[PDB]
Amino acid sequence: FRKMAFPSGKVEGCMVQVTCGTTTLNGLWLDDTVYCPRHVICTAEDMLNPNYEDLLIRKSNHSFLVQAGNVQLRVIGHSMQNCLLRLKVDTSNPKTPKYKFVRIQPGQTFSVLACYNGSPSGVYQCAMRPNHTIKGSFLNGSCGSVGFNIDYDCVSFCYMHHMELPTGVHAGTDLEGKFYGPFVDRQTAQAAGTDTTITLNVLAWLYAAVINGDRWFLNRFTTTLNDFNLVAMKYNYEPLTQDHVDILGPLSAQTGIAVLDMCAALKELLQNGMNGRTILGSTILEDEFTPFDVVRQCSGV
Amino acid sequence: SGFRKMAFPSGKVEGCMVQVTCGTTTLNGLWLDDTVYCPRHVICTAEDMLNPNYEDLLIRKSNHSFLVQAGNVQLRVIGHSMQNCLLRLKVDTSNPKTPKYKFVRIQPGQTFSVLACYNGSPSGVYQCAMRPNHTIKGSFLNGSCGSVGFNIDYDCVSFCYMHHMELPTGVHAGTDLEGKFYGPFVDRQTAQAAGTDTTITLNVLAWLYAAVINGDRWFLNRFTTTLNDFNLVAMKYNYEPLTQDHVDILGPLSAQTGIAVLDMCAALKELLQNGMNGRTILGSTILEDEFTPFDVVRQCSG
């Protein structure tokens, strides 16, 4: 059961390279606006304690060079929106797909189109961690790469990369320039807090297993929500809330397995392990597939 | 930082996918310039698939027998022909989204990206490796007949695989873009034994190098080994024999890291003999074999 990324073409046609002085990163070109991390105007030293409004004042439209493939896009306006720099260009992107900007919740997944200087390099699937960071792969020059989900013909952009954290983990913002987590675009001592396993997703994944005929772990018992959390939280799992139970409703109905009964199976797996067995071919409980990813991938259409 | 299984951006291939229908059978086709490529078994009903004679089946069709659609728009077929296990359909219009491309046949162990499609529409992309036994793992190849596998070098798409069959016993089988099957499989719905599979040693060693350039290093040790002695151990764990050619391939990664290939083989030998003791590497609890040395150099350098 592979984790798949969404087809990246629609986002590929929106990536450009933005350069301010000696700094270069990626930008997202939708209609006549290019969005990129505001720190593109910062040098490393400015990162110590930047006065963005002040730094942006000393910049003019000509301060930004925007390249779309072999084409230089003329910048005719700039401004800041939270942690994002917005650059108006004289040409509306002919490849602009139907889109939306959305702020994702911890635990939810999305695809990331890793780019290097405006040029798409690879695509992978990942999840927003409960601690608000993402475990990804961003080499030199990937800042500005974006995360997204596609629904039908609509691209829902939900993430833009800004920083690498001491852990080698990453931090960034939604497309309104608002950081996920307490993080900030400047050099501070900030670090990711302890993370937990995304219980909602592990349960989703166990439903996926059952849907695919791998069900040796099911049992004849059930559990109270509170009794489940009492055990699971001991194994560093996120507490399961009533809202999470409701979110698993469709999967519960499709399989005829009440959520608390699936919780009893999970409790047993955590307390007794798998005993050499595997689930969906895995020897480990997967936590980066959401209930929606399962429905999407098992109900295809 | 971080290390993820990464697929190539799929847009260049998305712009080439179409739907091909014959009678009541529909699957995906690849449209480049004025030609559409698809599995020849598009001409077969499920019953034909029990023991088809493609010659016989094909001579019974005409250009009008094929309905190809790009989205909801029909592309008129003006010619057809069979090339090994592929059906080639000439259409009256050219695909302006055709990228610079090449058709290549890869060797077992190599990786590529597959754009899973259904009825000619892009569904998802994933990275995989051609197993030593020529099958490919991925419950996701189900119903995606005609979906293709590829790698991208700069602006050039190197197509290397077309999905054809679901192998009763799991895994899927397919062909290169010349219509030649990978493996001892055939274009027919019969039980076909998939040879024994092995772990791709060359790739595991590349992945351990990845862990080292990424700061993992607990698995290293002070020993070394001869290639010969390494194989005597690895081959007991169902690992592919390692050759000097494979060791030479690891040279660059060895140069980076400053860890000799055979010393890394010595680390692996220990890993196979004493398991990982609950510890992890690059976040995984098992030795990963679907990243080639090239993949590693690509994701770890630039």
Structure description:
Chain A: This is 3C-like proteinase nsp5. Chain A: Monomer. Homodimer. Only the homodimer shows catalytic activity. The structure is a homodimer. Chain A is an alpha+beta fold and about 300 residues long. The radius of gyration of chain A is 22 Å and the shape is elongated. In chain A, helix 3 (about 200-210) runs parallel beside helix 6 (about 250-255), helix 3 (about 200-210) packs parallel to helix 8 and helix 4 (about 225-230) packs parallel to helix 7. Chain A has helices at about 10, 50-55, 200-210, 225-230, 240-245, 250-255, 260-270, 290-300, and strands at about 15-20, 25-30, 35, 65-70, 70-75, 75-80, 85-90, 100, 110-115, 120-125, 145-150, 155-165, 170-175. In chain A, the strands form 2 sheets. The first copy, chain A, has a 7-stranded antiparallel β-sheet with strand order 5-4-1-2-3-7-6, with no helix packed on it. Helices cover about 20% and strands about 30% of the residues of chain A. The longest helix of chain A is centred in the last third of the chain and has 14 residues, at about 260-270. At the A-B interface, helix 1, strand 9 and strand 10 of A face helix 1, strand 9 and strand 10 of B.
